[PDB]
């Protein structure tokens, strides 16, 4: 649940996490 799924009106759902400072714009399976 540690990934931030933020649905912005930019027309994109980004999953930014400080784990790697990475943003996964494709939905990870290890998101839990």
């Amino acid at each position: 649940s540690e990934w931030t799924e933020r649905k912005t009106a930019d027309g994109k759902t980004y999953y930014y996490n400080n784990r790697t400072l990475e943003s996964t714009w494709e939905k990870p399976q290890e998101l839990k």
Side-chain angles (χ1 to χ4, degrees), residues 12-24:
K12 304 174 188 53
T13 329
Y14 55 64
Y15 299 61
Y16 164 63
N17 195 332
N18 192 88
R19 284 197 63 212
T20 40
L21 270 289
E22 290 190 292
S23 51
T24 55

Side-chain angles (χ1 to χ4, degrees), residues 2 4 6-8 10-12 14-15 17 24 26 32:
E2 335 306 283
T4 296
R6 189 173 186 205
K7 56 186 67 183
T8 53
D10 186 84
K12 304 174 188 53
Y14 55 64
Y15 299 61
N17 195 332
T24 55
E26 184 54 274
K32 179 65 277 304

